[PDB]
């Protein structure tokens, strides 16, 4: 039963994974990461303290966010002494934000938190953002109280008017205003206010925010965005970069004004045209054609082959059949491959091999 | 040190013998694996093309960052004379050894090989039941007798002759016994791969008038063989050598066909723990080992008190440490044995101690000491106790007519490093017995 207990839990874990529909997701994002640095963040419930762990996971989130959302941008704000302090402008450079977070890691948190000040600052940072982007604010909250100079309800109404979306990660318990902010802003959904229960669950919560948010059916901002695919040049003598005005050896040439840029993806400093590589778009294709989940095969029927289709690992004999099949191609897969086929790879090897 | 030791031996051999050593592909396929990764890369490039490539072309392949590795690779490749530098037409051209080239081509492309890898009788034996047992016991006997633990079946004179003739296990007829030495504990501290290479390397130097190449045609070829299978029987020298190799637990013989053993494949390439022990502040030892080899080596510097099937419990004492030191075992080696055979519990607690130390003050990074420092300090102090009294054999020089002469003779002794003590006021000095004759001869002249 103990081994069966593992099986049934595995089936229950798979139950959630069974439902996968090709939701429309906003690939081009514009995130504002708000961190809480107040007296309440000096506690020791998270080792060594709340401030240290939050900053560390923020750096990891920055790495993951820009890895899977290459054509997005991020800005970082913190709450200190009842004021909102800006530490990073909206930009597509993942290194600027990590450097800012590392600097923040030293100073001791103190004072009171102010959601209204942070929300107002985030509202202003997302003003010069195109209409095709998804304006999002991810607040990491640790306090149980808010000291604001004005009416927070008016700010919430303004946020809803500007089509900004708020996700809040609380530390100890539910705050009434945070629930309202995450609900009135997400079209009534109450799943965007998450309260962790341990260190491990926090890492999952940060990891979940990396993926793009599905869009609402009545919020239509469909448009064609003018992009550019520059050609990398290899030069013999250094040349000035049009973005930082410093000598670098080689850089991509924009096809609209021929000015060179150090790194991609960025908006060209001259023609204001986004420069990206084809790979940066290919990094998001798995969010538009998600691979349909694999369902275990009951032992009543007869199996096809003794070994895995893609990895040639013989299935153990053991109660519970250790086989998962792809309905599209009907090829059995080992339990190990299916995790790697749906998290690292995003194409079923069986489907590709089949000719049409 | 494994590849370094084997390579170092292969460098000292004269060039005239290296050319003959590459006739058999079996040996070539083994020498090729020991070179650095860059060396193998270049060697594989030249093997298949019958031309001469300038050195500058090889330099172009390496990136600026890895330029340093290109120096070691070329030096090691030239030392074995695998790569022949020929200079002509104003260019330092580089070529591969024709015999090495042909041998590698035969090995890779399955050409005629003259049974360099041997043959197969297709009469397999059971590896687990016999091969593992035979060599494990045979290797057990040599190590047990090495450690000094009493044992019923003593090994044959062949390995016994080799053991004494090596620095391992110094012996004296007047003493009538054999005891381990400084290098002896180091040898027991080395992995199976190096533990086997030390004996084989010593055997190579011991033999006289049996060719040196043939003894290498067997050892390197023995690596090519795969365990758990038969190989029919070869050179004349390789017959007696095969029987001699049988005493070290390398090859098993039923009595026409010989079978290599786990150790045979353990020679070519690489590949709770048994032997892990706990040392307390009470100078106690609890070893989680069930193997007479580990128990015997522990008995070198441990006063065993009792044993169970799962573990062995004893106590560190001054008598045991003095007993080990008298044999030439240095305290540094002892602590190395304790540290590298430490239980996971000691490691985890030591890590926590380091974490707390860094938690209060992260400025300094204290070393991670798995076992308590008091035991190490006490062991070293006992070593100092042995070093308390210092005595030299030599002569005292005195009654000098002139200060000039006293300074002249004493300064000369200092120059040649045989002066142990001097006093200007008394015009006296003491020199070691080793330098007596040189000082006397200089005095006359």
């Amino acid at each position: 039963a103990s081994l069966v207990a593992s099986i049934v839990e595995a089936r229950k874990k798979r139950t959630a994974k069974k439902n996968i529909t090709p939701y429309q997701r906003g690939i081009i994002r514009s995130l504002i990461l708000t961190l809480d640095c107040s007296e309440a963040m000096l506690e020791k419930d998270l080792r060594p303290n709340r401030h240290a762990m939050i900053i560390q996971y923020a750096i990891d989130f920055v790495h993951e966010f820009f890895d899977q959302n290459p054509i997005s941008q991020m800005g970082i704000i913190i709450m200190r002494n009842g004021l909102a302090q800006l530490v990073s402008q909206v930009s597509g450079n993942p290194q600027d934000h990590i450097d800012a977070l590392k600097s923040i890691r030293k100073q001791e948190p103190k004072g009171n938190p102010s959601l209204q000040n942070a929300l107002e600052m985030a509202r202003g940072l997302l003003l010069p953002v195109p209409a095709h982007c998804t304006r999002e604010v991810l607040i990491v909250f640790g306090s149980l109280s808010t000291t604001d100079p004005g009416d927070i309800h008016q700010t919430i109404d303004s946020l809803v008017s500007e089509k900004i979306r708020v996700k809040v990660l609380g530390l100890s318990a539910q705050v009434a205003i945070c629930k309202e902010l995450c609900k009135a802003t997400n079209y009534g959904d109450e799943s965007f206010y998450k309260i962790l229960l341990d260190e491990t669950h926090l890492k999952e919560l940060f990891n979940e925010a990396v993926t793009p948010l599905p869009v609402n059916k009545i919020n239509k901002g469909f448009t064609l965005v003018k992009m550019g695919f520059p050609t990398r040049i290899f030069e013999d003598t250094p040349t000035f970069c049009s973005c930082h005005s410093k000598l670098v050896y080689g850089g991509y040439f924009c096809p609209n004004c021929h000015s060179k840029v150090c790194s991609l993806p960025t908006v060209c400093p001259c023609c204001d045209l986004m420069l990206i590589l084809s790979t940066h778009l290919a990094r998001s294709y798995h969010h538009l054609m998600p691979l349909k989940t694999f369902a275990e095969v009951p032992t009543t029927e007869k199996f096809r082959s003794e070994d895995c289709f893609s990895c040639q690992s013989r299935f153990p004999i053991l109660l519970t059949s250790s086989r998962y099949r792809c309905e599209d191609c009907k090829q059995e897969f080992c339990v190990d491959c299916d995790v790697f086929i749906h998290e690292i790879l995003h194409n079923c090897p069986g489907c590709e091999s089949k000719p049409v | 040190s494994l590849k370094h030791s084997v390579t170092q031996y292969l460098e000292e051999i004269p060039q005239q013998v290296q050319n003959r050593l590459y006739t058999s592909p079996a040996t070539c396929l083994a020498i090729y694996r020991i070179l650095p990764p860059l060396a193998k890369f270049f060697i594989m490039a030249m093997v298949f093309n019958e031309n001469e490539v300038p050195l500058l072309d090889l330099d172009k392949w390496v990136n600026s960052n890895g330029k340093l590795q290109f120096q070691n690779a070329i030096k090691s490749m030239k030392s074995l004379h695998l790569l022949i530098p020929n200079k002509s037409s104003g260019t330092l051209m580089i070529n591969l050894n024709p015999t090495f080239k042909i041998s590698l081509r035969n090995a890779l492309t399955g050409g005629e090989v003259q049974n360099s890898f041997g043959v197969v009788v297709e009469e397999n034996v059971v590896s687990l039941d016999l091969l593992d047992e035979y060599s494990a016991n045979k290797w057990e006997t040599i190590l047990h007798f090495m450690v000094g633990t009493p044992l019923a079946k003593i090994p044959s004179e062949k390995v016994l002759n080799l053991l004494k003739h090596s620095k391992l296990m110094e012996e004296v007829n007047s003493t009538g016994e054999f005891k381990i030495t400084n290098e002896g504990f180091q040898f027991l501290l080395q992995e199976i791969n190096s533990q086997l290479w030390t004996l084989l390397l010593q055997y190579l130097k011991m033999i006289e008038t049996m060719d040196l190449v043939d003894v290498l045609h067997f050892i390197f070829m023995l690596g090519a063989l795969e365990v758990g299978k038969a190989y029919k029987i070869l050179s004349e020298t390789q017959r007696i050598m095969l029987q001699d190799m049988r005493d070290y637990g390398l090859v098993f013989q039923k009595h026409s066909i010989f079978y290599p053993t786990k150790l045979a494949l353990m020679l070519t390439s690489d590949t709770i723990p048994d032997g892990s022990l706990i040392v307390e502040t009470n100078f106690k030892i609890y070893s989680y080992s069930n193997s007479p080899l580990q128990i015997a080596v522990l008995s070198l510097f441990v006063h065993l008190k009792a044993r169970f099937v799962n573990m062995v419990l004893g106590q560190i004492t001054r008598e045991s440490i003095r007993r080990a030191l008298t044999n030439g075992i240095t305290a540094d080696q002892i602590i190395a044995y304790l540290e590298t055979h430490a239980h996971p519990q000691m490691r985890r607690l030591a890590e926590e101690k380091l974490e707390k130390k860094l938690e209060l003050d992260p400025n300094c990074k204290e070393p991670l000491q798995v076992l308590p420092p008091t035991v190490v300090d006490q062991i070293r102090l006992w070593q100092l106790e042995l070093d308390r009294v210092i005595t030299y054999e030599g002569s005292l020089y005195s009654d000098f007519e002139t200060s000039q002469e006293y300074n002249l003779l004493s300064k000369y002794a200092q120059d040649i490093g045989v002066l142990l003590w001097k006093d200007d006021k008394k015009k006296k000095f003491f020199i070691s017995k080793e330098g007596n004759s040189q000082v006397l001869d200089f005095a006359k002249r």
């Binding site: 064609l224 290919a282 790879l345 194409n347 | 594989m44 590795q69 890779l108 090519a224 390439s269």
Partner: protein, 293 residues
């Protein structure tokens, strides 16, 4: 310094090599590649004794693991060679014999789409398995493709191959590609090598292939940072339009689906997601540059 796994993906198909033989004057060049590959795999097993080998052949109707053979023999190579070399070569040739027999049986079968993408995905899954099992191994993919035979449409290969690049970039698996055929460049596989620290080579003549394999595609993962790759082509990391099939340097991509477009789509509607664009917004793109009146 460390053992490394080499996973060779060979694209053997009756249609691919037949056109190669007809366009040239070399008959049965696949044997030349096969014997060259056999020596190459033997060379890899001689670099170190702890490195394995995997061969995944993509035949007309699917993929098959030539080595290691599944748990479910003829003499082609002399039994006097080294044991480990033969143990991998004899099985390799035996599975080649079976595959050709199986492929010949379904010669009349209509195989329209190539199966290179699936083979590459299978190799990556094998790389993940091998690394997970033993604990401390490197990896490397080698794709031997015959590009002489004119392909039908490579567009469908873009999404799978581009997904292999990211996965290969996560596990530090440099994928090298060797092309024997007419076209000098393969736009998708060339990007695969450049984006994953790999080596791309194209050779017109099948003969003398071992020289290329031994000198160019022999860089193990341990010494990749210190060796400069000999690749000569330069890739631009560009993609073809969706309704004109021409490489686009500056164009339009739909925000919803991220499909490139060289020109504004007819009907002011995306041809991939059926999403209607705002007439006002697209009019912005149509505007001509501002010049004094």
């Amino acid at each position: 310094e460390s053992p490394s796994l080499l996973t060779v993906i060979i694209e053997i198909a009756p249609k691919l090599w037949t056109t190669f033989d007809e366009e040239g004057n070399e008959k049965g060049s696949i044997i030349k590649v096969l014997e060259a590959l056999i020596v190459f795999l033997n060379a890899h097993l001689a670099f170190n004794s702890a490195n394995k080998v995997a061969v995944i052949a993509a035949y007309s109707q699917g993929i098959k693991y030539l080595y290691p053979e599944s748990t479910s023999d003829l003499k082609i190579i002399n039994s006097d060679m080294y044991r480990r070399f033969r143990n991998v070569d004899e099985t390799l040739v035996e599975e080649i014999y079976k595959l050709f027999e199986l492929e010949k049986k379904q010669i009349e079968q209509n195989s329209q789409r190539s199966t290179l993408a699936g083979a590459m995905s299978a190799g990556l899954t094998y790389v993940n398995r091998i690394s997970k099992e033993s604990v401390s191994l490197k990896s490397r993919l080698l794709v031997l493709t015959c590009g002489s035979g004119s392909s039908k449409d490579e567009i469908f290969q873009y999404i799978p191959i581009m997904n292999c690049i990211f996965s290969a970039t996560k596990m530090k698996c440099p994928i090298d590609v060797v092309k024997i055929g007419g076209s000098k460049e393969s736009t998708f596989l060339q990007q695969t090598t450049d984006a994953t620290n790999g080596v791309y080579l194209h050779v017109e003549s099948t003969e003398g292939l071992i020289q290329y394999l031994a000198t160019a595609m022999f860089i193990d993962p341990s010494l990749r940072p210190i060796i400069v790759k000999p690749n000569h082509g330069s890739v631009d990391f560009r993609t073809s339009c969706y309704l004109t099939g021409r490489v686009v340097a500056v164009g339009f991509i739909c925000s919803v689906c991220l499909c490139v477009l060289s020109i504004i789509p007819p009907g002011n509607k995306c041809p991939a997601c059926d999403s209607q664009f705002d007439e006002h917004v697209i009019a912005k793109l149509k505007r001509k540059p501002v010049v004094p009146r």
